[PDB]
Coordinates of C-alpha atoms in Angstrom, one line a residue:
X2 CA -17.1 27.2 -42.6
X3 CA -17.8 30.4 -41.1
X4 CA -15.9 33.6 -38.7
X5 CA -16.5 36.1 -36.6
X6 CA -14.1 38.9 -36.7
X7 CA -11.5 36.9 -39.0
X8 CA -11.2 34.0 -36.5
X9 CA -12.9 30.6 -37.5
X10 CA -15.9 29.0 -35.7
X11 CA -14.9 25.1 -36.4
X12 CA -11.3 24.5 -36.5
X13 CA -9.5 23.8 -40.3
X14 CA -7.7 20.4 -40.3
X15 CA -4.1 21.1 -40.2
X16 CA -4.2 23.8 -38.0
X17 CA -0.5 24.7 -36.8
X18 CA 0.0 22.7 -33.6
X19 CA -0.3 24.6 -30.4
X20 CA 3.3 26.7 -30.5
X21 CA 5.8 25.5 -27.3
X22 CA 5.5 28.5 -24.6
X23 CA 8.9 29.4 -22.5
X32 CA 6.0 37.0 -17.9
X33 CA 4.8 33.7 -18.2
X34 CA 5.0 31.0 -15.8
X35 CA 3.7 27.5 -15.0
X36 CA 1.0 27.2 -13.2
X37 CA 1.4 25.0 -10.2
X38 CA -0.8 21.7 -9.6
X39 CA -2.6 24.3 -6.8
X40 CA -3.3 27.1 -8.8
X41 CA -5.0 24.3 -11.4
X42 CA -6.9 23.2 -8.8
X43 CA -8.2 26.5 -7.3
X44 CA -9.1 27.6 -11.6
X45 CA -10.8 24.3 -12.0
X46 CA -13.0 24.5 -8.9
X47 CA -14.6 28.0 -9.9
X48 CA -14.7 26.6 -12.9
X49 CA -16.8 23.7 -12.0
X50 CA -19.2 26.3 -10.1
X51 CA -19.8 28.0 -13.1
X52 CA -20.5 24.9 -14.8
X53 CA -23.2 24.3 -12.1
X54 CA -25.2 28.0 -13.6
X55 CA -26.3 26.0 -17.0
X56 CA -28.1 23.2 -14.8
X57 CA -31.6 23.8 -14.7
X58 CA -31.6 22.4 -11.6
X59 CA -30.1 24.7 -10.2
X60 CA -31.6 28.2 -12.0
X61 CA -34.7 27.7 -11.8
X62 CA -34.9 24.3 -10.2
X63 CA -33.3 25.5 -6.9
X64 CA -32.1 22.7 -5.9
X65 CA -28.1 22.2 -5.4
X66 CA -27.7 17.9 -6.4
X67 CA -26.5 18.8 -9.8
X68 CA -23.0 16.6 -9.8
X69 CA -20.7 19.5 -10.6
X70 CA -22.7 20.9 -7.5
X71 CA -21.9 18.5 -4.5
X72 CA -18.2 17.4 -6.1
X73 CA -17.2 21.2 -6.0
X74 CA -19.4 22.6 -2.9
X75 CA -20.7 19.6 -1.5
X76 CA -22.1 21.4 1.7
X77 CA -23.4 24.6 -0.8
X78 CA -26.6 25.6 0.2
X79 CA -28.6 28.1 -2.3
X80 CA -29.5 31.5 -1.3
X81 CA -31.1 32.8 -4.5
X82 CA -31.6 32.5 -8.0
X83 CA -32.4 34.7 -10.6
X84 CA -33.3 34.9 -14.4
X85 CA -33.6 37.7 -17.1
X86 CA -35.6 36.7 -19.9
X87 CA -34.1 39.2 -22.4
X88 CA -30.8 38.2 -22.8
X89 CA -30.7 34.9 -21.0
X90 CA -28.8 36.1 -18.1
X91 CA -29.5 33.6 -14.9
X92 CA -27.6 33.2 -12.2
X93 CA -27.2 32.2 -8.3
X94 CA -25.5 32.8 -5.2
X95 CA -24.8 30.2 -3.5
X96 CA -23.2 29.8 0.5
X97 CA -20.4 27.6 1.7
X98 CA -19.5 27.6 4.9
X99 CA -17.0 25.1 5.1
X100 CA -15.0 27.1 2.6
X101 CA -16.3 30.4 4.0
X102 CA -17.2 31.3 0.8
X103 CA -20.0 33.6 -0.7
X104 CA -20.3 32.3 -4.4
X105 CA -22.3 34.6 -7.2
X106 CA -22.4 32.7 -10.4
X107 CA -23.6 34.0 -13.4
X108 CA -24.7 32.7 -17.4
X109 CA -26.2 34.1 -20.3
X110 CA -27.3 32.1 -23.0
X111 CA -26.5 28.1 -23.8
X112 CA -26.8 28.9 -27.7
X113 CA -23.5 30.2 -27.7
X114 CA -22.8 29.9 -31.4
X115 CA -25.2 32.0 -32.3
X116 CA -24.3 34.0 -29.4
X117 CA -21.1 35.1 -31.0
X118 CA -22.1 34.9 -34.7
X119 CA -25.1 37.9 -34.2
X120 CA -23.0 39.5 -31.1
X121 CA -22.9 43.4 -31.6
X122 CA -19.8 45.6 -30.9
X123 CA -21.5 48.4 -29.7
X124 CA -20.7 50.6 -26.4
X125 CA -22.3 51.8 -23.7
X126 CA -20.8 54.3 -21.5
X127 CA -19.4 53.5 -18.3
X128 CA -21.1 55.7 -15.4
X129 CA -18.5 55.1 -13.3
X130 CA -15.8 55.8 -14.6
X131 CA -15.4 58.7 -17.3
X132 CA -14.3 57.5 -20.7
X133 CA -14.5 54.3 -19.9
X134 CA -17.2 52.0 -21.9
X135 CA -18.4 48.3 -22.0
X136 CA -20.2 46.2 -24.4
X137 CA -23.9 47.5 -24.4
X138 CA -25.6 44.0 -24.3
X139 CA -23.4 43.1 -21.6
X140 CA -24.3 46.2 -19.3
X141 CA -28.0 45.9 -20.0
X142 CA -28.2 42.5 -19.0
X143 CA -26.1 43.3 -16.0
X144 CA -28.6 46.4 -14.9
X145 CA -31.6 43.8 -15.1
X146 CA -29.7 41.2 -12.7
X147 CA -28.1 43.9 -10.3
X148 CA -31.2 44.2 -8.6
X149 CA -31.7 40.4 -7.5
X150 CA -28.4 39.7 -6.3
X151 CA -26.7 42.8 -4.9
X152 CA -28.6 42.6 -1.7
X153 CA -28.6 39.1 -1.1
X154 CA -24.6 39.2 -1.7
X155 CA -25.2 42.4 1.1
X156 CA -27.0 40.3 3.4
X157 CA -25.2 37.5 3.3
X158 CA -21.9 39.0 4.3
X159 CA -23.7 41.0 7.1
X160 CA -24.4 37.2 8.4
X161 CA -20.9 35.7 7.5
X162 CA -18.5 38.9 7.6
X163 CA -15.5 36.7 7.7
X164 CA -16.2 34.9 4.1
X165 CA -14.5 36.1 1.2
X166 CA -16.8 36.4 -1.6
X167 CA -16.2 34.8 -5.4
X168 CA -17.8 35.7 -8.0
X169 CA -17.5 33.4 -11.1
X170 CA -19.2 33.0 -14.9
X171 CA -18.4 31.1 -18.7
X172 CA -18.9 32.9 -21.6
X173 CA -21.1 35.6 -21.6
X174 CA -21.6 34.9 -18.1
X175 CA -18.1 36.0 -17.3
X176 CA -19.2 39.2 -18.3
X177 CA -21.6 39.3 -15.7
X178 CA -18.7 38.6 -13.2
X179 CA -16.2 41.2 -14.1
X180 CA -19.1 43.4 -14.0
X181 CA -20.7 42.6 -10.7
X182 CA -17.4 42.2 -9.4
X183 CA -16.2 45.8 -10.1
X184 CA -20.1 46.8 -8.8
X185 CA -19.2 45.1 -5.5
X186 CA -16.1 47.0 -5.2
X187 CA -17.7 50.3 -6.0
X188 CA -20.9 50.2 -4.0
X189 CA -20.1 47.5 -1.0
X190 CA -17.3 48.6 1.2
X191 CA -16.9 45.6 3.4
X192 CA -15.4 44.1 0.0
X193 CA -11.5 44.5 -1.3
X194 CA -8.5 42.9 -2.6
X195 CA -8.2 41.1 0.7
X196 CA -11.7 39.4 0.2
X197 CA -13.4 39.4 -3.3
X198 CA -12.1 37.7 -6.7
X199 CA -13.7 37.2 -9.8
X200 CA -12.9 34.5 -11.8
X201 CA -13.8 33.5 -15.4
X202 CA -13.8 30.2 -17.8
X203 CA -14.4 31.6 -21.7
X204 CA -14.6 35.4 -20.9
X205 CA -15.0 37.4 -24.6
X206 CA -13.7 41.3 -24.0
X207 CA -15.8 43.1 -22.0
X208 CA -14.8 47.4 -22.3
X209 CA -12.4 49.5 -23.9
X210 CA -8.7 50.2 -22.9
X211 CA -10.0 52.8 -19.7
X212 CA -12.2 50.4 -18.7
X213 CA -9.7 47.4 -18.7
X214 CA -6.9 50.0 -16.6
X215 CA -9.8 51.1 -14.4
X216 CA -10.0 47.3 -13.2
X217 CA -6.9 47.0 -13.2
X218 CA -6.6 49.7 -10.9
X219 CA -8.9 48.3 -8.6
X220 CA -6.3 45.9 -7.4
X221 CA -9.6 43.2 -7.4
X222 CA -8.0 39.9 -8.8
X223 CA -9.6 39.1 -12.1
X224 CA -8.6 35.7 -13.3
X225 CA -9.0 34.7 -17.3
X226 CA -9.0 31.2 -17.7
X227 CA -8.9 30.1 -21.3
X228 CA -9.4 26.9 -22.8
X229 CA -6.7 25.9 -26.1
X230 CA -8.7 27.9 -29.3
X231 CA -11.8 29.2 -27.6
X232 CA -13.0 31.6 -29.5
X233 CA -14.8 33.4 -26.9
X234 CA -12.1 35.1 -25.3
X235 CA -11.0 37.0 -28.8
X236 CA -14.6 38.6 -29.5
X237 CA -15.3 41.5 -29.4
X238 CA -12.2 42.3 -31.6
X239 CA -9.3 44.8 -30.3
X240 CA -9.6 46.9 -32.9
X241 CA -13.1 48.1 -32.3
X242 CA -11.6 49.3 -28.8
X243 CA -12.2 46.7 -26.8
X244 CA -9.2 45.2 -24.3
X245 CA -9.0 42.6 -21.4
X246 CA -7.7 43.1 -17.7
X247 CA -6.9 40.7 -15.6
X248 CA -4.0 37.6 -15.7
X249 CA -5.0 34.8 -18.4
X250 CA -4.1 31.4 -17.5
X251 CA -4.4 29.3 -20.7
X252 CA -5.1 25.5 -20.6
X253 CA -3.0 24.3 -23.3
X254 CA -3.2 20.9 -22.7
X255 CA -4.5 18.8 -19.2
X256 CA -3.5 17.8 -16.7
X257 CA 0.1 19.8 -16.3
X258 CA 0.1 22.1 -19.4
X259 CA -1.7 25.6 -17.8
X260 CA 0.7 28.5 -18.6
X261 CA 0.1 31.6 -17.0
X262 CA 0.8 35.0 -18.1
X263 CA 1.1 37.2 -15.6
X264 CA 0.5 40.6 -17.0
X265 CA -2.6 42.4 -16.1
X266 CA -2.9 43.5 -19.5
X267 CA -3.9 40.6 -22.6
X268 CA -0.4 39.9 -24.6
X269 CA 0.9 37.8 -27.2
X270 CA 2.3 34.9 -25.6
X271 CA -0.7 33.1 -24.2
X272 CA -3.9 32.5 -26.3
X273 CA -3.7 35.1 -28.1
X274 CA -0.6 33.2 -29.9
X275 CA -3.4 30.5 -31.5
X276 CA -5.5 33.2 -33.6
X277 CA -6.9 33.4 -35.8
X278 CA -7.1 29.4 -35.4
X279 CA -10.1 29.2 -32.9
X280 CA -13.0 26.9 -32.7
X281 CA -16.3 27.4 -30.6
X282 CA -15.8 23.6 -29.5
X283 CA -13.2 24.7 -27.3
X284 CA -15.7 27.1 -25.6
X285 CA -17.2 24.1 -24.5
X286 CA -14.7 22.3 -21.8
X287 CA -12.7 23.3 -19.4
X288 CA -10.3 21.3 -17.0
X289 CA -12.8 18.3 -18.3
X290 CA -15.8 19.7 -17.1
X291 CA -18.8 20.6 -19.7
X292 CA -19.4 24.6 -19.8
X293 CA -22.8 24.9 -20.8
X294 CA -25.1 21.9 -20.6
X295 CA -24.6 20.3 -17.2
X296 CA -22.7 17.3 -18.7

């Protein structure tokens, strides 16, 4: 069939096997567990149940945050961007989940390279659809996050998106560090299932920089995480750990900075079916 920036959609038949890994490290059976918890939350974002049900029964909901109680949701109509935050306080933790939209196929096949500028940071640039969507969601979160720390001041605070909803993440993320000073390397993390790139090469140092940990989990082919293409400009921070096969199989390369040897090693051999599951749980309709 079809691709998107040379990389197929539906995987051929006889696709070279997944190439044996030997910096890049293992991850331990704790580290899977912390990447497939997160993940579960932002499973939780595509139940409507949750956004705009408000309710927190879904079952990715009470087998990952079983005492979460719901502080807010929020929806943009435009893009599809919806999202929560969500309050746990037997894991002292302030959660801000985030989608865009369930049709993710056509998500990726009509996606847009185009940049937007930055504001702040000079030279630095992110994906104009991403940005606009993030400037319409800014406004019903950021205070609640705000508020909810003010309450809770000794909760570290996760932020945590699929697809197009990881965007959102990095994005708030790096807004929380800019604009909410209680927040730091000591106490916020962003962490992503299916992230595509998000800015340029400035805007991928400038995070970077921040010292905020920005985990990349990817899931065997997904095509998500290769779009937008590198050659239009764009780049990934942040450390990809790439499920290559469950339950043991996670490797983890621990450059800041996307290289060669972890999923980057299956293109252009992708598939948006893999966009679909991670660590076993269903990313985008509340399976």
């Amino acid at each position: 069939t079809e691709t998107v920036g040379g990389m197929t959609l539906d995987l051929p038949e006889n696709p070279p096997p997944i190439p044996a890994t030997s910096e890049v490290v293992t991850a331990t059976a704790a580290q899977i567990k912390e990447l497939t918890n997160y993940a579960g939350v932002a499973a939780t974002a595509y139940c409507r149940s949750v956004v705009p049900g408000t309710k927190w029964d879904c079952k990715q909901c009470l087998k990952y945050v079983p005492d979460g109680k719901l502080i807010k949701t929020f929806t943009s109509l435009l893009t599809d961007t919806n999202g929560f935050i969500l309050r746990s306080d037997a894991q002292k933790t302030i959660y801000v989940t985030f989608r865009g939209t369930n049709s993710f196929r056509s998500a990726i096949t009509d996606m847009v390279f185009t940049f937007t500028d930055y504001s702040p940071v000079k030279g630095a640039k992110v994906h104009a659809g991403f940005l606009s969507s993030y400037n319409q969601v800014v406004k019903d979160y950021f205070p609640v996050v705000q508020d909810q720390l003010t309450a809770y001041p000794d909760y570290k605070v996760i932020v945590t998106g699929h697809s197009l909803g990881g965007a959102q993440a990095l994005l708030a993320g790096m807004d929380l560090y800019q604009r909410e000073k209680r927040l730091s390397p000591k106490n916020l993390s962003i962490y992503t299932v299916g992230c595509p790139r998000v800015g340029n090469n400035a805007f991928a140092y400038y995070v970077d920089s921040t010292g905020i940990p920005f985990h990349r989990t990817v899931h065997k082919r997904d095509i998500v995480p290769h779009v937008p293409p590198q050659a239009f400009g764009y780049l990934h921070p942040g450390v990809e750990s790439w499920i290559k096969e469950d339950p043991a199989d996670v490797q983890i390369c621990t450059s800041n900075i996307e290289t060669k040897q972890c999923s980057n090693s299956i293109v252009p051999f992708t598939s948006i079916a893999d966009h679909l599951t991670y660590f076993g749980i269903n990313e985008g309709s509340c399976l």
